[PDB]
Design an enzyme around this catalytic site. Structure first.
Site, PDB file in Angstrom:
ATOM      1  N   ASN A 351       0.793  -1.211   0.000  1.00 55.10           N
ATOM      2  CA  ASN A 351       0.000   0.000   0.000  1.00 55.10           C
ATOM      3  C   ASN A 351       0.844   1.289   0.000  1.00 55.10           C
ATOM      4  O   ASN A 351       1.974   1.300  -0.480  1.00 55.10           O
ATOM      5  CB  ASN A 351      -1.031  -0.022   1.141  1.00 55.10           C
ATOM      6  CG  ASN A 351      -0.443   0.420   2.472  1.00 55.10           C
ATOM      7  OD1 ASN A 351       0.590  -0.106   2.928  1.00 55.10           O
ATOM      8  ND2 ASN A 351      -1.085   1.396   3.099  1.00 55.10           N
ATOM      9  N   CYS A 353       1.613   3.140   2.772  1.00 49.12           N
ATOM     10  CA  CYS A 353       2.506   3.195   3.915  1.00 49.12           C
ATOM     11  C   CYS A 353       3.290   1.930   4.094  1.00 49.12           C
ATOM     12  O   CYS A 353       3.913   1.749   5.147  1.00 49.12           O
ATOM     13  CB  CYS A 353       1.734   3.429   5.186  1.00 49.12           C
ATOM     14  SG  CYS A 353       0.727   4.875   5.104  1.00 49.12           S
ATOM     15  N   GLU A 355       2.549  -1.146   4.821  1.00 48.39           N
ATOM     16  CA  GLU A 355       2.244  -2.124   5.845  1.00 48.39           C
ATOM     17  C   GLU A 355       1.340  -3.240   5.308  1.00 48.39           C
ATOM     18  O   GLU A 355       1.377  -4.360   5.842  1.00 48.39           O
ATOM     19  CB  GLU A 355       1.648  -1.482   7.095  1.00 48.39           C
ATOM     20  CG  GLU A 355       0.129  -1.347   7.090  1.00 48.39           C
ATOM     21  CD  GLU A 355      -0.353   0.014   6.589  1.00 48.39           C
ATOM     22  OE1 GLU A 355      -1.421   0.481   7.073  1.00 48.39           O
ATOM     23  OE2 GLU A 355       0.332   0.626   5.723  1.00 48.39           O
TER      24      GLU A 355
END
Ligand code: DGT
Ligand code: DGT
Ligand code: MG
Ligand code: MG
EC number: 1.17.4.1
Lengths: 664, 664
Positions: A351, A353, A355
């Site tokens: 994604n 970020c 994670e």
């Protein structure tokens, strides 16, 4: 300092007291410039509130609005609490309660229990949830992993619409583009040649600005993923650069690498690396590990690409990361080897970020919904004062609730694009994480780099996973396993640490759990994915994430509370002390008269070796179902210094090697 | 001068002689970098050539390649003739023959007749036709009028794809946007506000660059249309400005105005004008003339917009036109009052060159296909030498063929988007025009501003319309009227000049024609729309369009042939003569020793009053089924000077008031 007991108490003057009455104002609301009804609660919820008005207004303990700090609360104020005519209508205890209903429906039991924990700051939900839960068309989901539909204009523009449509509510985006033919490739339909990847980036960048999260809110934010064997790679890493050919950059998107091991091998063996257009080498991104090297290697020998020094591209990469703090590095194989979703096909990206690691495809958009547990809130003075302890029993209990919560959200979520409803209803990924990790260590008088802290990090994350699996298990007992469960590593009894090849730590009965999972299934394809928590750790007042403190003194200037108190007890807190934190970055190191044990406890993340950081990241990762946002911090960054952070972590089998790179 | 008999004869050395053999090379062709078959003829045509190889190769009179000039032919060379490995394979007589087949199929009779006229330079087809006719997926259409699908993201991005998909083959575009809510308007789905029209322009602008006509050919070209009552109007006219806020311009698109009469009235009455968001004033662009003022006026009084001085916007407009030569001005009412397509609904825009006026809608994309008749080629030395004449009988005969030709193209055209196949198959608009108008006048020793020339202009255009209707009539006799014919002004016997309220000139039996049309229908909804002809008038060697000469000396420096000869006959062509054309723009005016009659014949368009230009434009317009691209040229442009060109023409009932504005 005092203007938090004061700005909180002021809105208590300028706001309605009864909850049911605030719902009423919202539900009935009408935009004055347009004479148009603009309700801010949904029918479903509005009704619920009314039919329990008494039970509900008498739940809200209003003395709980005083658990928020200065900037904690003025953040809830500026952007979170629902607003009548620029006037705030929602008290903080009102946003919570509404969120709890927005989540729990007619289970007013779950609602009230969820309200209590959120108000006593046991945990919280990600921003999309806090904003939208309980409102007209609730979009409660932070992130979207999108597939490039096909190597054509139709495909490209179909993906571009989708991104607008997603960007227009407000969810980050991870898009991957491994399949777009590279500069120069042939086009059959117009006897022509491709300008490649960059101009395509540029369009997306553009849509990202235009679609400012629902008009006048926030400008869109895209992560883009490539495999470094794609021929446009040198230009793709440079997308955020500060200098020349403006027509060749794209400053509002984030480049990330989907890195195959082969690449890392080549680089350390100082060998060759071959670049392809996906049309010359089809299939490279629909397989991984061994099958990939077998196929990559053959394409290679077949003369299909352009070879250069593996090390040429690597230097390019580190050069870009040093200057921009990007691209991110997510390890492709690490991800696919150890994902519970592998029965779905090959995962092609992370994604925004870094994670989330979830399966995506032209007609399936990977979705995930986050919450974060407040690690400090489980600390308690022991059974004989003068000493503290961590309640893993409650933590477990708590992660169970958030786990159940994150499920209802899946069912009650409003989906921007059909791809995402199809995706989420089939696989049901959920994403828990943490905050107050550096606070927890601090409270406990355990330096971030100690052996006790190292141990704590392991066991916290153990109980969180074990719990989030136990409760995903009970739900599969009630509602059936997720549809795609048959085939998974999980269905065989292979859990997350098994596929890292480790025995668990053992604080929890893993044998029994696996027995039940094998037996009844689990509800979710995935569960654990610690996130940046930037926005919400601010609100609860904890240091974000699992990263340590960057500074003991922020900015209005606020000094680390836990340190602040220590100093005044040690009778050394004067003015000279304040002044050796102001310009000198807030590092209590090498400081005239401050006890070596405080120096050990209050280290700035720049004073923790990035070797230690990686180790703990490698340790908790065995219980992380997805990946996690691992930021890296170096002060004096030489080329080689970066080179051994990347390699170390890769050899540690990390999925996310680097999210950002903060420098200087 | 001589290097045209020389560069033509050189390619005759380096090119295959037999036609069937060139087809063979093309059809069999394989891209070497990809080992992929890339034929350049279609199955259908390839076959046709083979099965008539003898009849066809013996048609091509190769001595006809010497009818092209210097830059005429090096234009066919650089971009038109099909290319093997950067090597040219097609002779000019090969491109023609292929075009003739690409058009005519198994009617090898029509083919051969079409080949002869094109080679003897009687007429030609627009660029898309010349390029693509007879090739794999023949896209033979110059222009597209596109509707903005709906005032939503879905609608916007659906329109943006369509524009890419169109832009990717190669057809200009006229898009209109009257319905997009203006800066500030509310959005229900995200409790938000609109950044309006400009950022939306910016995305389109962007797609226009990215989709470079099929990759590596030409960057896209969009005309955009608005009604000046739209609230974003001040920013929309400025889109091509040279100065500040880069984030607020869009330099690769062309703003055009869809101007309601009301606006012009307000401006001359020095009164008010009220600006609306389409969401506050819905429907303004789904009606015209009276019904419009009735509705506009009411919205107004109802307080729905923001009023300013009609004259404020007007000044804004002239300011932009002076500096950029844009926006264009097309008169909305004039268009809708006098269109044969009025039974379809309200026409909402023109094309990219302002000559097409055709019905468009979310699911119907207006298409048009052009050709241009070579006006000079019908001049002949009288019936007793020493004097010249114009053959209106042949001209009529010729326009009939081009009319039939333009029909087959409708059937054999390959359509980029379904909207355009739906549109074109229903209404069947065709677009004839002219070139060599200024040449014709010259040859005939009739100055552009004479009474004989004024008369000629009228009768040329008369026979062209009368013919193109006669033959559209015979086709409806063979294949049925177009489906949407029932209801039209035409079905009642109302022809183009009728709805301008004039008797025709009368050179042709209009009574009989109307009798047949009423009786049997016509094949086409529309027929006549004189175009810029920029590219193709170059090739045939004529002055483009109907505009007069801009200069008697172009640039390599080439002097107007017809003048050049006159000078040497008048024994005054030395060097002093050459030198008083070089720096002094090529105006033979006020020149030491050149007979006043030559001065009258060789006027530069800047020396023709724009009052005369407008008059002739107003005169031929009675026989122009659509509109026409009227460029305007002023040297010393004062604000008022522009103001009376616009108003004069408007009061003349012109549809297109101004295309470009060339200045200085
Ligand atoms: N810059 C640029 N790229 C283009 C243009 N047209 C197509 N492309 C690129 C984008 C796509 O990844 C690739 C394939 O586009 P399409 O599938 O629409 O091409 P088409 O089906 O005509 O040809 P193909 O058989 O796929 O080579 O070509 C263009 O006009 N400009
Ligand atoms: N700049 C900008 N404009 C937007 C955004 N979202 C919508 N718009 C504009 C473009 C459209 O002309 C207008 C309507 O968009 P939609 O029909 O998708 O809005 P929606 O159906 O949610 O709300 P509505 O009921 O139409 O007000 O809003 C955004 O995030 N940024
Ligand atoms: Mg294709
Ligand atoms: Mg809407």
């Amino acid at each position: 300092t005092l203007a938090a007991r004061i700005a909180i108490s002021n809105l208590h003057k300028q706001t309605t007291k009864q909850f049911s009455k605030v719902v009423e104002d919202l539900y009935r609301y009408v935009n004055a410039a347009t004479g148009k009804p603009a309700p801010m609660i949904s029918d479903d919820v509005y009704n619920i509130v009314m039919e329990n008005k008494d039970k509900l207004n008498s739940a809200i303990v209003y003395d709980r609005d005083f658990q928020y700090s200065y900037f904690g609360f003025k953040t809830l104020e500026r952007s979170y609490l629902l607003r009548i005519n620029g006037q705030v209508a929602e008290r903080p205890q009102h946003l919570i309660m509404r969120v709890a209903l927005g989540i729990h429906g007619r289970d007013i039991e779950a609602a009230l229990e969820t309200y209590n924990l959120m108000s006593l700051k046991y945990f919280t939900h990600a921003s999309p949830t806090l904003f939208n839960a309980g409102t007209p068309k609730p979009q409660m989901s932070s992130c979207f992993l999108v597939a490039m539909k096909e190597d054509s204009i139709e495909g490209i523009y179909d993906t571009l619409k989708e991104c607008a449509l997603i960007s227009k509510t407000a969810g980050g985006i991870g898009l991957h583009i491994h399949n777009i033919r590279s500069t120069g490739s042939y086009i059959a339909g117009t006897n022509g040649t491709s300008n490649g990847l960059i101009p395509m980036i540029r369009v997306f960048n553009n849509t990202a600005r235009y679609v400012d999260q629902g008009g006048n809110k926030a400008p869109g934010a895209f992560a883009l993923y490539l495999e470094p064997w794609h021929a446009d790679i040198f230009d793709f890493i440079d997308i955020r650069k500060n200098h020349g050919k403006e027509e060749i950059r794209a400053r509002d998107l984030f480049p990330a690498l989907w890195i195959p091991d082969l690449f890392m091998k080549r680089v350390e063996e100082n060998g060759t690396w071959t670049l392809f257009s996906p049309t010359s080498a089809p299939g490279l991104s629909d397989c991984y590990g061994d099958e990939f090297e077998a196929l990559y290697t053959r394409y290679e020998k077949e003369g299909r690409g352009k070879t250069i020094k593996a090390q040429k591209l690597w230097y390019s990469i580190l050069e870009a990361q040093t200057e921009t703090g990007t691209p991110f590095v997510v390890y492709k194989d690490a991800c696919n080897r150890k994902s519970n979703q592998k029965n779905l096909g090959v995962i092609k990206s992370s994604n925004l970020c870094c994670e989330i690691v979830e399966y995506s495809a032209p007609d399936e958009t990977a979705v995930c919904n986050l919450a974060s547990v407040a690690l400090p809130a489980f600390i308690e003075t022991s059974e004989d004062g003068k000493t503290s302890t961590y309640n893993f029993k409650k933590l477990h209990e708590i992660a169970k609730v958030v786990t159940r919560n994150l499920n209802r959200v899946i069912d009650r979520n409003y989906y921007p694009v059909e791809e995402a409803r199809k995706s989420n209803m089939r696989h049901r990924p959920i994403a828990l994480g943490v905050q107050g990790l550096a606070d927890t260590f601090m409270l406990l008088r355990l330096p971030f780099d100690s052996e006790e802290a190292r141990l704590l990090n392991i066991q916290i994350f153990e109980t969180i996973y074990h719990a989030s699996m136990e409760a995903s298990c009970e739900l599969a007992q009630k509602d059936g396993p997720y549809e795609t469960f048959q085939g998974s590593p999980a269905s065989q009894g292979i859990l997350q640490f098994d596929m890292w090849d480790q025995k668990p730590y053992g604080m929890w009965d893993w044998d029994t759990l696996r027995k039940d999972i094998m037996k009844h299934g689990v509800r979710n394809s995935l569960t654990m994915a610690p996130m940046p928590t930037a926005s919400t750790s601010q609100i609860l007042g904890y240091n974000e994430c699992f990263e340590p403190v960057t500074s003991n003194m922020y900015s209005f200037q606020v000094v680390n509370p836990y340190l602040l108190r220590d100093l005044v007890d040690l009778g050394i807190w004067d003015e000279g002390m304040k002044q050796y934190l102001i310009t000198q970055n807030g590092s209590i190191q090498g400081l005239p008269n401050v006890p070596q044990e405080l120096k050990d406890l209050y280290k700035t993340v720049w004073e923790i070796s990035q070797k230690t950081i990686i180790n703990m990241a490698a340790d908790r990762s065995v219980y992380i179902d997805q990946s996690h946002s691992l930021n890296l911090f170096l002060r004096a960054p030489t080329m080689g210094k970066l080179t051994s952070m990347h390699f170390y972590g890769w050899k540690k089998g990390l999925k996310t090697g680097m999210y950002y790179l903060r420098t200087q």
